[PDB]
Design a protein around this nucleic acid. Structure first.
Lengths: 292, 392, 130, 100, 191, 111
RNA sequence: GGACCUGGCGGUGCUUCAUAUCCCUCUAGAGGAGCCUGUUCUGUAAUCGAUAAACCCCGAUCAACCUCACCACCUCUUGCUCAGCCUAUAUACCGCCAUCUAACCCUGAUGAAGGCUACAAAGUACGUUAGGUCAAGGUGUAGCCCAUGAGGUGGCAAGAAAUGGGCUACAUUUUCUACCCCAGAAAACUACGAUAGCCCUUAUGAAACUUAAGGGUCGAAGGUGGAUUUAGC
């Protein structure tokens, strides 16, 4: 067990060690920060162990050692919080606040906070059912015409899961020396790697490694594959393509080219068509590869 | 030289010396094993070849009775074997080369009929027998005997053989004359004036045979002259002036001898004034004894500026290598730090205390008493706890 | 040391000979290791030394090598690389810099220094023989 | 003081293989060319045959240097699989790790 | 005894504590650094007695302060690149020939590496005094050593044991190739 | 920690260039390591608290060992000198020992 | 003898389903011949082990000599170690695998006893085996000790089947050539097919029918193989 005197001595030792490390690395001890400590300890004690926690670490004793309870009452004996005797002062204080916000309104891409990190925020163990009750209150608050402060309060209890699955990244339109607008993109299928350049205006001329596509791809199926992206958005005969592919085989090269042309063509179609191409599987790298 | 582990760091001067001696004894045991069984260490795997990591061979390889085996035994410093083989060559009627017998007689006179590890010159020792048996005795033979007797304290026999050398119309070398000077000073029952006159006569002879001195001649003159105290001061200063005039530069040994002759004392100021800023190289065996002696004076005179001057001379270049063995180092530093504590302001005393201890030396209890007295004089009584923790 | 400091120091003797000095167009230093963090620290050290001595240095990372084999129980050996390209440095700068960074080569790290010396044509190739 | 009799026999073979290598190479070089007359090639077949049988470089086996195991020996370490696995599992073989 | 890290000031001269490469000494390094995978409800192991910290090739002897102090003292050994040679365009003009040689630094009792004897000479044929016939004959003699795209003749010599001998042989090979390209035999007319 | 953590949580006891791609003399270094470990375990009986760490830089050979504070320091110095000299002459290289004493076995858990 | 409490049930049947392995169903192949490789017996002067049972493309990421620890004789003896034994013993132990078999608080009148409802009503905190294995992961003990140890030169017999594994075929979605996928011929008996047999060259080696690669000769059976079996993901 770690007595408070032990933690105090550890804090003093860490401060002196921080000043020593700043002396060693030539940096000013005053502005020396934890990122600087991490960089310096990575330089001085190089360790490529895969486990980041098995590497040398110089952290504040507060961070590295566990924590303890807080005092809930002073020497007079009176608890600080008015909901102390419930035994769940933090949770019920939060519920009380939410109910007051709902009363005020009644007078007038992301994920819900999960139970364990709610416990961390409240610093109180709570059951499943009371977690559900809190989440139902939060949902009820969201449904109402919540204001700015209310939306911030709700944002306190919602982390991110990312909404970018909606949106594929659109390449920027570049200009060649002739003044023709084009867009470049890359794709990969098995070991085949392709880079395509799609010109805004064209007549459907596709050049693979400086060769016409029907001569590079004798098999009809590969030409079907190259046709798929433009055909999907009804833009056959409206672009010129200059692609370079390397590695893989016949079908892997065809698929890599198809992905590269789809990603490059994303620049010249509407956002709705970008989403449609995404839902058709035309913008997703195929990860299926040979297993060991 | 020690290990930074707290359990192995020496805590006292005695402990430091004990640890060093233990380490050297371990090295010696390993060397004994290596030389005793070379067959386990002959396999060489190092490119480039390292000669210093190979076993050493101390045994004769030539076994026949021949002059080459004798030369081998002389190279190996195997005294008894060399004597026995010289006798066997005499019995075999094989005539020995003059150079070979001179090498043998070098070995015998240097080692005094003993094997490698004082030995007093024993009458009719092997050197004398070999010397008398020699068909032709050249100058080298006489010089080597005389030097040998002088080393092993046969001063009277050394002088007699020098007279015999003179009778044979042969010449003596510089080192021979140094030995004769030492022998004359070590001859008993003579007064200061007689010995000084004889030293002058030896120098007159060294003029006569066209022999030019070196540093060691003057150094030996001063070392011997040290024995005669106040009567010697002006002659010693005169000898120093002679050595400077002739173009032979003094060394640390010369100044050491002069200082220890005068200390029994303002010549040290001029000696320092001449030595300031100069860099020195090892020219005499006694050079390493200078700084100690110099520091001794600074303690007796209680002159701190002179102590700083001496220390600054020690710090210039590679001068520190002349601090000598650990006993001399501890003496020098103890006197130095005692003087700082006695005469310097307390904060500079504390700075010197932290810079010198334990990195330079391990203090003696007298130094702790002196430091406490200095703190008492300076009325900085807040420091006794740290000093006692250090002394513990 | 606060007070007890060396008064004068014997700097090494570096004699300027009369012979011409070698010119190295490039100097490729490939360091190999089993550990990426050591190679990163060594990159930091080498690059800082190059900057402080005025040498022109650029760093890159060749792809790693993995030797797998089986005795079932399957063992592996990873070899990671770091390449330091020094450029436009003479023979003496090359010698001093290489001695420094080779003496400070961490355990488990092997080095391969490729030196591209610049030379003139021999006088025997200036004109044909008659 | 080798591991066993079999290792000692192989140490004996490697010694003579070293001593006879130059002479074997030269006599073997005469027989591997279609220039010299067949009268000379036929005799070198006799000269090479008469040389001591253990001098032949084909009679040397790569036994383990610690256990004298005849098979399962990785030539790069001269160690049998059992001895290698012992050292590799203890992290005493620099750079060796279990694959993942 | 107590560790000496307690006696170290916060503005000391660290390079003097670790002048050269040495193994991690917990009683000399005044850092509360920890290394080890922690146990359940545990903390990474302290430095005292830690073998993992003892297995790291630490860079405590090369800190930025020490590196700068070392590189300031080592400036005296350097010579200056001739200013005339600004880029490769002038380096290949004033010094046509390029000699590549490689050194290998491993760890072991032996320094010998057989791969260090290889020498590579590279010269552009446009920098040699060759007429049309000489250039044609040189190309046909060298064969695949010459690359048409780069106009570079590459002679790699590794016959001799040493590197100086291989360099001499490469120079000799170039000389003989040039002189025999500048010679016309009887059979030449049979082209 | 088990053998499958050798590059994840543990390190390598011995460090040298032999096992790198393109390097030579791996077997020689391995045999040297085996002899060094046996020799040290027999020359420091009951002193070594943990395994040796054999480091190799250029021509050098550093044995960084962890020992106990049970044997007297004089014997430690004697053994260090003896081992340094004997191993230096046996391998024809400048060997060097870097003893680190601990009060007792540094226990990590109780398996 | 009356009333009550905990039960267990070391017990069953049925109902619904979650019901994954195991089923069942479903998909795609192989299985019948010719070879090789282990192994079984047999045979032999002729390695071994696997000792109840369930793990032979087992030790071996490799057997002309060596490897080799098997057999015939010949030949040496305090012997590479000062010995040495692939000699026995885990049917001596040891490693290994395997077979089998709390505290507190409330309620009931302070009885055995009981303690939950979320729009919340008392609950909070091993043994066993004539087992395997000495490629020892070990430690000991018994034997042989002018041979249970060395060394040399030659030899491990093979045809009856019984299996496993692999290879190669029985073709037309095929074979050859160009080419690397827009062609031309061949085609069921001079069709396909043999890693089948025999002969000749090349490689390595001291030694090659005896190991491998190619060429020639040859063009066998084979004609798609049920019960079964192999995977699926």
């Amino acid at each position: 067990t770690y007595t408070e005197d032990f933690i105090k001595k550890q804090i003093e030792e860490f401060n002196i060690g921080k000043r020593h490390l700043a002396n060693m690395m030539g940096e000013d001890p005053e502005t020396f920060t934890q990122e600087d400590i991490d960089r310096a300890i990575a330089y001085l004690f190089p360790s490529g162990l895969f486990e980041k926690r098995a590497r040398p670490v110089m952290k504040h004793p507060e961070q590295i050692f566990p924590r303890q309870r807080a005092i809930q009452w002073g020497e007079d004996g009176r608890p600080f919080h008015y909901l102390f005797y419930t035994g769940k002062q933090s949770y019920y204080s939060l519920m009380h606040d939410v109910y007051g916000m709902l009363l005020n309104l009644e007078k007038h891409g992301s994920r819900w906070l999960i139970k364990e990190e709610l416990e961390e925020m409240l610093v109180e163990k709570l059951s499943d059912l009371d977690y559900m009750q809190f989440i139902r209150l939060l949902e009820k608050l969201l449904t109402s015409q919540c204001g700015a402060a209310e939306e911030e309060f709700v944002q306190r209890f919602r982390r991110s899961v990312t909404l970018e699955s909606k949106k594929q990244l659109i390449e920027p339109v570049q200009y060649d020396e002739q003044g023709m607008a084009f867009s470049k993109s890359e794709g990969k299928r098995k070991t085949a790697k392709a880079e395509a350049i799609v010109y805004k205006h064209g007549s459907g001329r596709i050049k693979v490694n400086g060769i016409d596509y029907q001569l590079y791809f004798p098999i009809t199926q590969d030409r079907e594959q190259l046709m798929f992206p433009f055909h999907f958005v009804d833009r056959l005969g409206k672009h010129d393509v200059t692609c370079t592919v390397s590695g893989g085989g016949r079908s892997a090269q065809a698929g890599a080219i198809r992905l590269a042309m789809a990603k490059a063509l994303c620049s010249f179609v509407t956002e709705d068509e970008v989403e449609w191409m995404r839902q058709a599987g035309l913008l997703t790298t195929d990860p299926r590869v040979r297993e060991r | 030289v020690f290990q930074d582990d707290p359990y192995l760091m020496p805590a006292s001067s005695l402990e430091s010396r004990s640890f060093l001696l233990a380490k050297k004894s371990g090295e010696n045991v390993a060397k004994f094993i290596i030389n005793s069984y070379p067959k386990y260490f002959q396999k060489d795997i190092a490119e480039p070849h390292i000669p210093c990591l190979m076993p050493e061979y101390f045994e004769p390889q030539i076994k026949d009775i021949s002059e080459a085996a004798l030369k081998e035994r002389i190279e190996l410093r195997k005294v008894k074997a060399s004597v026995d083989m010289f006798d066997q060559l005499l019995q075999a009627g094989t005539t020995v080369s003059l150079e070979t017998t001179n090498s043998l007689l070098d070995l015998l006179c240097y080692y005094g009929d003993q094997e490698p590890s004082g030995v007093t010159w024993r009458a009719k020792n092997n050197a004398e027998r070999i010397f008398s048996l020699m068909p032709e005795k050249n100058e080298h033979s006489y010089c080597t005997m005389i030097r040998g007797m002088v080393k092993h304290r046969a001063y009277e026999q050394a002088l007699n053989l020098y007279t015999e050398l003179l009778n044979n119309r042969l010449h003596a070398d510089v080192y021979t004359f140094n030995a004769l000077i030492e022998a004359t000073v070590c001859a008993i029952n003579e007064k200061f004036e007689e010995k000084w006159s004889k030293i002058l006569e030896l120098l007159r002879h060294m003029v006569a045979q066209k022999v030019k001195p070196n540093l060691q001649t003057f150094n030996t003159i001063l070392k011997c002259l040290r024995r005669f105290h106040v009567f010697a001061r002006s002659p010693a200063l005169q000898v120093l002036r002679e050595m400077k005039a002739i173009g032979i530069e003094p060394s640390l040994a010369t100044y050491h001898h002069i200082i220890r002759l005068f200390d029994q004392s303002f010549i040290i100021y001029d000696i320092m004034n001449e030595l300031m800023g100069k860099r020195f190289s090892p020219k005499d065996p006694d050079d390493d004894k200078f700084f100690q002696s110099a520091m001794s004076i600074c303690s007796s005179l209680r002159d701190l500026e002179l102590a700083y001057q001496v220390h600054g001379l020690l710090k210039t270049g590679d001068n520190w290598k002349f601090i000598g063995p650990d006993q001399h180092r501890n003496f020098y530093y103890s006197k130095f730090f005692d003087l700082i504590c006695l005469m310097e302001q307390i904060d500079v005393t504390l700075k010197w205390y932290e810079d010198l201890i334990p990195s330079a030396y391990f203090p003696h209890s007298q130094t702790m008493i002196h430091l406490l007295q200095a703190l008492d004089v300076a009325n900085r009584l807040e420091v006794i706890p740290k000093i006692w923790k250090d002394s513990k | 040391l606060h007070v007890d400091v060396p008064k004068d120091l014997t700097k090494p003797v570096v004699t300027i000979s009369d012979e011409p000095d070698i010119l190295y167009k490039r100097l490729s230093v490939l360091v190999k290791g089993h550990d990426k963090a050591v190679l990163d620290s060594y990159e930091y050290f080498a690059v800082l030394a190059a900057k402080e001595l005025g040498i022109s240095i650029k760093v890159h990372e060749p792809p790693r090598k993995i030797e797998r084999f089986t005795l079932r129980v399957q063992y592996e050996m990873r070899t990671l690389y770091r390449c330091l390209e020094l450029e436009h440095l003479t023979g003496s700068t090359a010698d001093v810099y290489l001695e420094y960074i080779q003496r400070n080569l961490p355990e488990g790290v092997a080095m391969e220094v490729t030196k591209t010396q610049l030379e003139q044509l021999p006088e025997h190739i200036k004109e044909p023989i008659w | 003081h080798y591991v066993d009799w079999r290792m000692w026999r192989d140490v004996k073979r490697r010694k003579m293989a070293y001593e006879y290598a130059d002479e074997r190479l030269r006599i073997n070089s005469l027989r591997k060319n279609t220039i010299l007359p067949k009268i000379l090639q036929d005799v070198a077949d006799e000269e090479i045959a008469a040389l001591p049988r253990d001098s032949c470089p084909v009679r040397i086996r790569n036994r383990c240097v610690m256990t004298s195991r005849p098979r399962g020996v990785k030539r790069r370490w001269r160690l049998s699989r059992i001895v290698f696995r012992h050292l590799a599992d203890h992290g005493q073989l620099s750079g060796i790790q279990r694959a993942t | 005894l107590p560790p000496r890290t307690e006696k170290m000031a916060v503005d000391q001269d660290w390079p003097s504590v670790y002048p050269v490469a040495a193994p991690f000494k917990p009683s000399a390094v005044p850092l509360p650094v920890r290394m080890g995978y922690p146990v359940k409800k545990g903390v990474p192991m302290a430095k005292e007695g830690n073998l993992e910290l003892l297995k790291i090739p630490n860079f405590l002897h090369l800190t930025p302060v020490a590196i700068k102090k070392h590189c300031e003292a080592l400036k005296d050994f350097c010579t200056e690149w001739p200013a005339a040679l600004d880029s490769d365009e002038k380096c290949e003009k004033h010094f046509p020939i390029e000699i590549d040689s490689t050194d290998y630094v491993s760890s072991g009792p032996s320094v010998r590496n057989p791969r260090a004897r290889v020498v590579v000479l590279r010269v552009k044929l446009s920098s040699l005094n060759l007429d049309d016939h000489a250039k044609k004959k040189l190309i046909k003699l060298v064969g695949e050593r010459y690359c048409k795209t780069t106009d570079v003749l590459t002679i790699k010599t590794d016959r001799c044991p040493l590197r100086r001998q291989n360099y001499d042989y490469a120079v000799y090979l170039l000389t003989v190739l040039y002189h025999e390209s500048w010679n016309t035999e009887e059979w030449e007319k049979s082209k | 920690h088990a053998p499958h953590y050798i590059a994840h949580r543990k390190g390598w006891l011995s460090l040298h260039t032999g096992n790198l791609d393109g390097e030579d003399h791996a077997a020689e270094r391995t045999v040297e390591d085996v002899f060094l470990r046996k020799f040290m375990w027999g020359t420091f009986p009951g002193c070594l608290a943990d395994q040796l760490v054999l480091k190799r830089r250029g021509n050098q050979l550093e044995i960084c060992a962890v020992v106990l504070r049970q044997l007297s320091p004089h014997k430690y110095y004697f053994l260090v000198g003896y081992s340094e000299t004997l191993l230096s002459y046996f391998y024809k290289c400048p060997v060097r020992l870097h003893l680190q004493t601990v009060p007792s076995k540094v226990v990590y858990k109780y398996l």
